[PDB]
């Protein structure tokens, strides 16, 4: 897809710098450190044994979709804990800010929802009850396992509490 925006590149650089300081055995290392909604074209530039992003594109997409569409924080944190993710990143693009410019329907599809059988109103209502809503729309104020730690434009970086 299209090249990542400057805010995204900056956010990714801030996280890489924060992760570069880590020292581990290579086996205690998390499956991957950053959970975000990737476009294959962008993801291919970051995948490596550094384990910043998911080794397998599809698995990473399903992980992120299940996480973002979760209705309970307990389900979301379970996914993040399993992969050992330290950062979760959101942006206006994956939310329902603009029904005509959103990747949320795609996220819903990957998560297994038949979004195409839903009205715009139903998709918005669904979105408002997700963990993604509580992250991006409320800056994790009502989430106990996630803390907003950095922002670059509308790209928000959340740190998993207890990772």
Curated annotation (Swiss-Prot):
Motif residue range(s): WWDYG motif: 37-41
Subcellular location: Cell membrane
Site (Interacts with target acceptor peptide in protein substrate): 103
Segments on the Extracellular side according to the record's topology features: 3-163
Motif DKi motif positions after renumbering to this chain: 93-107
Region Interacts with target acceptor peptide in protein substrate, residue ranges: 37-39
Origin: domain of life: Archaea
Role: Oligosaccharyl transferase (OST) that catalyzes the initial transfer of a defined glycan (a GalNAc-linked heptasaccharide composed of 4 Hex, 3 dHex and a sulfate for A.fulgidus AglB-S) from the lipid carrier dolichol-monophosphate to an asparagine residue within an Asn-X-Ser/Thr consensus motif in nascent polypeptide chains, the first step in protein N-glycosylation.
Family indicated by similarity: Belongs to the STT3 family.
Domains as described in the record: Despite low primary sequence conservation between eukaryotic catalytic subunits and bacterial and archaeal single subunit OSTs (ssOST), structural comparison revealed several common motifs at spatially equivalent positions, like the DXD motif 1 on the external loop 1 and the DXD motif 2 on the external loop 2 involved in binding of the metal ion cofactor and the carboxamide group of the acceptor asparagine, the conserved Glu residue of the TIXE/SVSE motif on the external loop 5 involved in catalysis, as well as the WWDYG and the DK/MI motifs in the globular domain that define the binding pocket for the +2 Ser/Thr of the acceptor sequon.
Descriptive protein name: Dolichyl-phosphooligosaccharide-protein glycotransferase 1
Gene: aglB1
């Amino acid at each position: 897809g299209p090249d990542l925006t400057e805010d995204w590149k900056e956010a990714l650089e801030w996280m890489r710098t924060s992760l570069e300081e880590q020292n581990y055995n290579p086996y205690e290392k998390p499956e991957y450190s950053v959970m975000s909604w990737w476009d294959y074209g962008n993801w291919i530039l970051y995948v490596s044994k550094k384990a910043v992003v998911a080794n397998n594109f599809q698995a990473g997409a399903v992980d992120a979709a299940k996480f973002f569409t979760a209705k309970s924080e307990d389900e979301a944190i379970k996914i993040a804990k399993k992969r050992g993710v330290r950062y979760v990143v959101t942006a206006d693009e994956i939310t329902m800010k603009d029904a005509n410019n959103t990747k949320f329907p795609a996220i819903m599809r990957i998560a297994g929802y038949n979004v195409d059988l839903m009205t715009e109103g139903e998709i918005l209502n669904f979105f408002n009850h997700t963990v993604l809503y509580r992250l991006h729309m409320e800056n994790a104020e009502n989430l106990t396992h996630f803390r907003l730690v950095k922002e670059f434009g509308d790209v928000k970086i959340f740190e998993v509490v207890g990772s």
